[PDB]
From a paper:
In Gram-negative Escherichia coli bacteria, FtsZ recruits cytosolic, transmembrane, periplasmic, and outer membrane proteins, assembling the divisome that facilitates bacterial cell division. One such divisome component, FtsQ, a bitopic membrane protein with a globular domain in the periplasm, has been shown to interact with many other divisome proteins. FtsB and FtsL are small bitopic inner membrane proteins (103 and 121 residues in E. coli, respectively). Previously, the structure of the periplasmic domain of FtsQ from E. coli has been solved by X-ray crystallography and shown to consist of two subdomains, named α and β.
Our crystal structure of FtsB bound to the β domain of FtsQ shows that only residues 64 to 87 of FtsB interact with FtsQ. A synthetic peptide comprising those 24 FtsB residues recapitulates the FtsQ-FtsB interactions. The structure of the complex between the periplasmic domains of E. coli FtsB and FtsQ contained FtsB residues 64 to 87 only. We showed that this subdomain is indeed necessary for the interaction but is also sufficient, suggesting that the remaining residues within FtsB are disordered in the crystals and do not bind to FtsQ. In accordance with these data, it has been shown that FtsB truncated at Y85 is unable to complement and interact with FtsQ, whereas FtsB truncated at D90 is fully functional, and this is also supported by our data showing that FtsB 64–88 binds as well as the entire periplasmic domain comprising residues 22 to 103. FtsB forms a helix, followed by a linker largely in β-strand conformation, leading to the final β-strand that extends the central β-sheet of the FtsQ β domain by binding to its last β-strand. The only helix resolved in FtsB, approximately residues 65 to 75, makes a number of charged interactions with the rest of FtsB and FtsQ, most notably two salt bridges that may be involved in stabilizing FtsB’s conformation (E68-R79 and R72-E82). Both salt bridges are also involved in binding to FtsQ via D245 and R247. In the FtsQ-FtsB structure, FtsB Y85 is oriented toward FtsQ L226, a position that was previously shown to cross-link very strongly to FtsB. The complex represents an exciting target for structure-based design of protein interaction inhibitors shutting down cell division based on peptides or peptide mimetics, as the FtsQ-FtsB interaction surface is small, the 64–87 FtsB peptide is water soluble, and the interaction is easily interrupted by single mutations.
Residue numbers in the entry:
A (entry chain B): 64 to 87
B (entry chain A): 58 to 82, 90 to 260
Amino acid sequence: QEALEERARNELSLTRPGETFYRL
Amino acid sequence: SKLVLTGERHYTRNDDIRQSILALGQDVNIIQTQIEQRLPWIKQVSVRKQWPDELKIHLVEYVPIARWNDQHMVDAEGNTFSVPPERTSKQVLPMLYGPEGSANEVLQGYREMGQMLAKDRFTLKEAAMTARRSWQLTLNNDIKLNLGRGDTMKRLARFVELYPVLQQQAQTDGKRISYVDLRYDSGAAVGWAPLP
C-alpha cells in the first residue's frame, strides 16, 4: 500500500499528478 | 534522611528524590533501586550514607539526542527513556520514529544520513523508519524526503546533487518545495506547495 506506491514509482516510473520528475 | 544530591540534574527535581525515599515508609541498596524504578530517566544513581543524618546521592541522567516516537526519548548510545512532557517541551530536538524495538537501528540511520546532509548544510528535523524499513526524512526547511527501503545514501546524494535546480525552479514559479520522492532508479519526483 505504501509498499504499492513504492513499487509503482520504482518499477514503473509513475508519479502523482502535479509533481515534477527529474532523472539524474 | 537529610538529603544532598550531586550530579548534572536537568530533568530530576529534588522532590522526585524526596518522594522516592518517602515512598518506602533504611538501606542504601533499596533506595538506589527505588530511585531507578521511579525515575525512568535515571541511567545511574549511587547513594552513599554519611553521618550525621545525610544521604549523599549521585545522579546520572540519560541525555536525549532526540525525541523517540513522540512521548519518549533516545540518547546518543541507543537508550530509550521517557520524561514527563511538562519538563521536556521547551526543548527543540530532532524527532526519530521507529517500530518499538528499533531505536539503535533508527539512530544508526539517523547518524549516517544526518552526517551526509550536514556536509552541505541540510539538517534533519525528523527521521522515521517504518516496520518495513522504509525511510522518510524531514529537513529543517520542512522539505520531506521519501527514501523507501533501498540505498538511502545514494538517493540522498541525488537529493543534494539535484537541490539547486529545484530551488531556482521553486524561485521562478514562486512556490516552495514540499517533498522529494526518491523511490526511483535514477530520478526523483518533487511535490510543490504554495508559499507561506
